[PDB]
Amino acid sequence: VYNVVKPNGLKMIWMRRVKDTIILTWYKNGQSISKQILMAGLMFKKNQYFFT
Amino acid sequence: MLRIKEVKKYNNRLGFPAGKEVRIRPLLEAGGFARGPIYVKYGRELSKHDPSSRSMAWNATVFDTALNHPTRPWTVTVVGGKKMVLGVRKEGLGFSEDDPPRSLNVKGGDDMADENYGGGNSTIVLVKSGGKDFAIGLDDLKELNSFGIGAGNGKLSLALGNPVNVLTGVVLPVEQRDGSVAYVAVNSDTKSVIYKVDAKGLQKNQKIDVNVRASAEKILLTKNNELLHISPQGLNVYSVQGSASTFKYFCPYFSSFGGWSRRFVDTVTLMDEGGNQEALIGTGPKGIEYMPVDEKCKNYVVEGVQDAKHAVVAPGATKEGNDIKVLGVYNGELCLLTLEVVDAVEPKLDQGSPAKPSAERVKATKSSKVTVRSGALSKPVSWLRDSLDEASFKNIVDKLSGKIRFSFPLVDLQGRMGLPIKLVVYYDESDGE
Amino acid sequence: IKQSIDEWIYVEADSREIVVSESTTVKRVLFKIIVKSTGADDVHVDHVRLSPVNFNFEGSVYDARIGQRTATIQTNGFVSRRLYDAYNRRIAEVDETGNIKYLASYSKRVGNTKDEKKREGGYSSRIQMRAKHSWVESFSPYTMEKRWQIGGTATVEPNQAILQGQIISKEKFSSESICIRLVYSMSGSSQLSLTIGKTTVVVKPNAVQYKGHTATTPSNAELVIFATPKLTSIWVDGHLRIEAPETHAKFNNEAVSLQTSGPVGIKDVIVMEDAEIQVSYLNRDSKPLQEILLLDSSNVLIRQMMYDVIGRRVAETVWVQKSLIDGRSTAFKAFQYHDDFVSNDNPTDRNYFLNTGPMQGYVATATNTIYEGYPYSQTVYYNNPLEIRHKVGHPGVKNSIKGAFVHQYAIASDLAFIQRNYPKNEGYRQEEEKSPNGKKHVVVYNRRNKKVAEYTQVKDYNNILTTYIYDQHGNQIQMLPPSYYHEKSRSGDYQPEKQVVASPWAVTSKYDSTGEFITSKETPDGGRVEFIYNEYNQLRYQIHYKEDKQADKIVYFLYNIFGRMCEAGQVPANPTTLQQVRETTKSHQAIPNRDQAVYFDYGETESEPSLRGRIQRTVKKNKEVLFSEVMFFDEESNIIRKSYISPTTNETLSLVYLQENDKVSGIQYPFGVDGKQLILKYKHNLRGEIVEVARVEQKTSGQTEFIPIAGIDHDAEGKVTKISHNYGDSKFDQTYKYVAPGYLVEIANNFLTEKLYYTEKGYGCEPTGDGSILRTEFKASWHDKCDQNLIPLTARAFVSGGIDFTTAETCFDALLNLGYIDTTGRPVKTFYPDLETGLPMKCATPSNWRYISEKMLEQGYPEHYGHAYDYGSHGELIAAKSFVGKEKDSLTAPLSKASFANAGMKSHELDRFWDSLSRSINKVEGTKAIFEGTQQLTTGLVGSVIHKPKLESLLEGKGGDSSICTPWSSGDRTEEAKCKREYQQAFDKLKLKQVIQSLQEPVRKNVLRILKNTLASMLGNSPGDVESFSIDPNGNHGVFYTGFKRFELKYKHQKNQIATIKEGTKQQEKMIVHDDEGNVIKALHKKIDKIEYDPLTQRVSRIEMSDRSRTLEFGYDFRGERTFKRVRNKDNDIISVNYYVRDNKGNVLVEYKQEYPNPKDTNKPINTVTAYIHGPLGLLGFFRNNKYYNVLLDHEGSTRLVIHQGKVVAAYDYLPYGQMIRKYGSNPEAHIAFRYTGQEFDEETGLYNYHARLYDPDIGRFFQMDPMEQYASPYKYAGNSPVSQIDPDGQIAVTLVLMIIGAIVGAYLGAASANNSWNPAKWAW
């Protein structure tokens, strides 16, 4: 049980020192995910809410 | 929505309900479906009740079967001023008989009917038109019609029947009017076809209606000449004109998703609202349910805590103001049910959490009652007894030479943030002075 | 300024204005930060930090004097502090909100006695507490006035106060338990008074004084006072100094106040409300001797443990509930050690319970009517200094050591091959147990206690030998199932393999050097999945291989700057894709062609600090479609609010949790009942198990009144005993009744009672030591609590297309004439036509018999029913015989080994007689097997039935008495003449088998009548029956049947998958084809053309029914829980749309169902919203359309009854392996899909989603591979899975929290240190 998801927590499954360029690529991954992430009427609201 | 006002129980039992199905009918007449002594068929047994005294008159074992068969219908009628019932026996023979006697009428035809794994099958029913009873029926091959001249000398005469339905299913359009029917229907999932029933019964004249995806478990007709249509999909309302195919509107109320199987659709009937409008009532999964026929459809389901809520409703129900009267059979008992139609009200609630917010204000006012102390004032005396571990005194003895040897710390302070201090004391037996 | 807390404000400056353009190189920029007061007044700054906005901040501070980590700083901006003792022990922790997590204390060695002569006591003691609302007072001159009402002058320092006069608390506690702890310093005659409720504690420098007595104390010690309405208990310096009873009323508006005469300085002050306390007295090895929990206001729970002269555990009592309200005034030792808890304690004398057997006296013998003198479970050890089990005895006289159902183990096994292949006394310890059912089980163990092989055999079933081979680091490199050994040896001799080989049956793993983790996991049914790691040992890729050793699909993981996982995707295998994996393992970048990819953004860019590192925002993207959901974790990752965010509206569909002590105390549903929000309040008691579920009702005056939903009653052992549905007008109780060993026997209520038998009555098996359920017997009496018109059996229930309408009437009348129906429509007993000698030949026709009996069992509602079970070698359920009638008292016996020693022939005559008869009867033919040449007589209606009057006229006579032709032709008159012509010919041609001819008349007098009873009624012939005749050593049943539906399964060569399925007597071959990873993609016996799975959740995505009649489309979250279902029609129009709002565990809470009855005109739908109320054992009920329905559950958690206002509105009956026998309910609003074991039953396709796996009740086998390997085969199912019967996430959870607090106490105390034991088995040699 963790806030952050472990590799084994997913359902797909069947650090002494770090170089500069590795930090830059990790930052690129973080910025990429940050750029990606960003009575019938109630039935319409919730059906748009669950999946679109 | 419907509120049960009162339940009145009849004074006579109906016996055990094992393997029996109910069919209750009030006296049918040419002039109208007037209130009269009701005749029930329970099992193979026909019983007479009078609504005045609400007591059983007689019980004659007339019938041959208990399950209301599609091949053995029965009804009451009045003909010649004399009330009769008339049913179908196991030999295909009509058993016409007045209330007390059993005058076997002459018959020009004896239907033979048999059941198939292919589901399309022979059925016969008793319909009324023009004051005369028609025993109409489809045998294995096609559909033909008959009518009783009466008892005595009367004999079934057969009018001309043309159709041979490719896809065969026979329900009669049932309506609350002086005649038992006006039309007769042959239903398929692609379209229904319908034939007018006249002084000669079945005519050639046919009035196909378009209704798709619907196997048409029931068909109803109004005195206002709009055609109801109960289907597993729902209820589709049609208007009968020179062409009956015009589609009025649809409501999903009487449907399979609503729980309306075969046994619940068979009960629904019509009754006048009072203002020359008609509404349809019948028992279902939730119980007796009643709906006015209107563009905006709104049913009313009985919501009450009783035992006679789920009752097979007799035809010919009545409405008087906002009150309705229905006759029902529950668990082999007869109950007259008085109940009221209630339009649902529910005052809306708003302003749940509008509460006036504001900013958060913080200012540090130190209390004048409480004073910060200058310099320390107390130094607790730690006890070496609690801090001294006992792991040094558990396995002391050396195995090799049989001596004992142990080391314990005399001072050991590592609560320092600086460099820790430890001074250790050792015991080891030796021969040196 | 972003947030504030008490007197302190948090201020931050995000420099988000400019960043590097492309991040090829570094900017090398300068930061100058200035902290200044903009006015004349001073500012007080505690800590300053500078970082990038991403990096997770866990700055920690240490105490300048005592040198321990006393406060940490989370990223979100809040501080969580630890509180330390005088000897640097971690006694408490404080959460971010200010309410403490736990408190701990122990017996101090200063308050001890040098010389003492006692017979019973604890060497040391520990006390642990967890409280609802509980604050530590730092005597800050800025916040004390808002916290305390001060009347006198006082002088303070950080966490210390030299006070004079009195101070009162402003909180005004109103709860069951109140308690406070503090540290003082007493000088001269300066005296301190602590008033809680009515009780004032007066501590002096010499002695602490209470109203009853005064106890000696040192002048400086830790003081703990625990008060309930009936209790007071005062610890000083860890030793319980006083304890006294109280007659005070309930606590309401009680105030804690301190009043001091003279100078005293109190160091720490910790005030706890609704504090749940536990005391543990420990022996010389710091092992618990006696535990005392506080259960409730004036109710404690005691358990005592015994230890040997060497130090090993011998016996342990069960939890018992002692009440303090009726303490009888003999003594009062509610938390002190109970000398008289067990009188048979001393080994020397007084009839020690190891020798004699029963204990003589408890304090409150709440167990003696249940456990009949033996509440303890004990263990007897072999003659060894180590702990090797010889005989272990459970509570109960029958289950004790002296009892019959005792577990006995042997180190030496009788089998030569186990002793000669595993070298005895060379680090291979073997234990062997034998059950009276004719089964033995042996397990062989490594040095490091990992089983290397286990073997088990049973009577008449072949032996089972499974083996596991491990590595140098202890990792399991290989395992071999029993199919391998059965194929190889194929005899009694076995050779348990010791080394890793290549074999298609083996499950192999190949970990890297120094045992990193699996690099190739290979199974026979699936394939070889290989793991690819990074330079920093991050799990980067995971490739799957087909059976032709070619790649299938590659799962890729992308990682953040933090080192946590950024996103996860799956891409199809390709040479360019494999080369891209090879390159990107070095480049650290992403795979380019990601079609579906789930992104995880735990909040770190949010401008609201309280969210940062606390939310979990998930974006799930499967091709075009998307799904966003974010949930709020508080401290220690407990969910406080789950939201389903969509871009169209700023508001979020959310369900809010209010929880303390890691237990959910309230739920705020997104549901509206009676136009108001549904708020559920769960009330727990002092033990933390659930005691009530209620719903909030708001009143216009400004108050909320709770309407109870269910009041739950528990036992002393944590078992739930009585659920009391007290909501609405009709309130009723469901009581669970238990017995001596701890099993559940009765589930009793006014609607439907259940009885379970464990030792008394079985089918053919004796009581197995496993404690498996041998018989379940129901008694339904709800048949007058419902719409009774739907109950009676009619004659149309028997008719359908296949049978004629007229024959149904005659067959139903014949059925009623024999008393099969008791004039109500409820079947009286099972329809066995071979028992009824006189019946119509239309009924006695075989296929008509099957259909008539099946429909009589399905549409009928019998008053009594049940099953009697029989189990196999793998622990699975191989047989179950039903008793739908009054048969429950006198069932038959299994045909095999029937007791014809009672027949009148000798044992040597019986053995040859049974060998000949068992070789000459084909039992499945029934009584036909008694006669010769029955194949030639099947041509005719008379010839198919004549074997019964011929049998009856053989020995019994009477019956028809040569005039039976007229009773046979009930439905015809002509057929009687043909009967009379063919009767004498069929009567004369029927000649008996030579075996029974060779017997003699004084045997045949009566024996053949009961022989016909067993051969007619045997396990094939009820419509309620599950069986599995032949079974692979891996537990794959080669034929299984349910009712009259018989599936004969032939399995693939080297796998556990199904090769072919035969549907029954027709033997028409329906096909079933799996995938490369083992999951079934098509099973035409369920009329499924194709199953499409989800690449991300590995669950079902698209189910296609046969001839394209229906289509089910599923969508999920990342957890694999179902989010929404869409059922389409033949014309690709949506018929039903279902939406689930899932709890974290997987439970559903709110469900929106919109069903369109006319697909074309969707403007007029049917809309229904339901909300489920879950409990300990299962869902208690559901609100649906302003209406609440109760749900009544049986054992194992299946849904038996659905009740509305005291009326049964739905009812379902099940048979084992999950297939439903029958259903009562006709109202569609009343039905729920939870069905068997509370697992959603897909009504359209007939498949349960049994814990994120499809299941087929007709086959009794899972459709997907088992993620956690439970059996030798992945797809095997047990047959029945009972519930824990213990309140989960209540009693068990908090008991585990008590144990981990004990663990941290022992760790700081030095219990887990080098050579810290008085037992040479635990010494450091």
Ligand SMILES: *[C@@H]1O[C@H](CO)[C@@H](O)[C@H](O)[C@H]1NC(C)=O
């Ligand atoms: C008529 O019906 C009654 C129950 O209403 C039943 O008891 C009786 O046996 C039936 N037969 C006659 C002839 O009364």
